[PDB]
Subunit: 162 residues, 2 copies
Amino acid sequence: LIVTQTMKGLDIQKVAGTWYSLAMAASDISLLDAQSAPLRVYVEELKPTPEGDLEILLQKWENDECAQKKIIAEKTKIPAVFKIDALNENKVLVLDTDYKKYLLFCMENSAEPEQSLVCQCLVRTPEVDDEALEKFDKALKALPMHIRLSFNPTQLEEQCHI
Amino acid sequence: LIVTQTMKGLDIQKVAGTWYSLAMAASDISLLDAQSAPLRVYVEELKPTPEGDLEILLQKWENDECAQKKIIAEKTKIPAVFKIDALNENKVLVLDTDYKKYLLFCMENSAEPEQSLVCQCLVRTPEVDDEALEKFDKALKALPMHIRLSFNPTQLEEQCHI
Ligand SMILES: O=C(O)CCCCCCCCCCCBr
Ligand SMILES: O=C(O)CCCCCCCCCCCBr
């Protein structure tokens, strides 16, 4: 309830497929700090289940290797909001998407939200889309972000972005 | 020669005194990555010498302590450009400043410049100046930055920003 942008009319079937985490931003430097930072995750594929949920395939640097994790984001009453399971009451929110190029989303804890806010700009191809990054910065100016990372084409094609 | 912004009529005597590194940005994530990242420096004081040079007092996390270093930036033919000494031919450039509130500067190697570009937004008081941060982002949009850090008032008052 910090993000004032949510997408009207989200057809989660159309956001299916391959995605690249072009940019990331968090309210805390320690969330995206190093490669092993807790919320430094790279999205691989989004798979909506027929029930209406969302299977997320991502890569995260855990041990000293690029691990592949599979998270499930269950639907709620609001079509643009999903819930992930743990002691952390995390909510994923889709802010904007044209389905064919980009998708902007934020993640936050429902109790300690502001120290959990982490947002990303996902794009379909391994290219630097300026239009998408502009929109991402636009949605970010109203939020308390303290770190912003951006990756280049070469890094987008590597496991865990090198 | 990547930064297209330099300040006309820089009176380096007026930029004397106390300064806080409110925001930092680099062309490489590894330059500002962790607290011990090579170019993660926090400006304390700027002291212009009568000869026209510039003594820079900064803090950098070296060992496992917040160290205080003293660098000298010698003047060149252009009043807004200074040179620091090492095997690295680094040039400091002052892009804009109103002397009383903020100062924007970038640093780069004259041979491997783009992988050396690191810029900062310095402000006089430990407050989040929106006007200064807007100007900083404006000067940054034309440059290849891949990481952007920002600090809050509480961190600005701590050695090495906590
Ligand atoms: O295993 C972990 O600790 C990391 C969990 C990271 C949560 C990432 C959620 C990504 C959701 C993307 C939704 C795209 Br609509
Ligand atoms: O000792 C080191 O290795 C770090 C050198 C860092 C160079 C910092 C230069 C800061 C210049 C500020 C100028 C303000 Br006009």
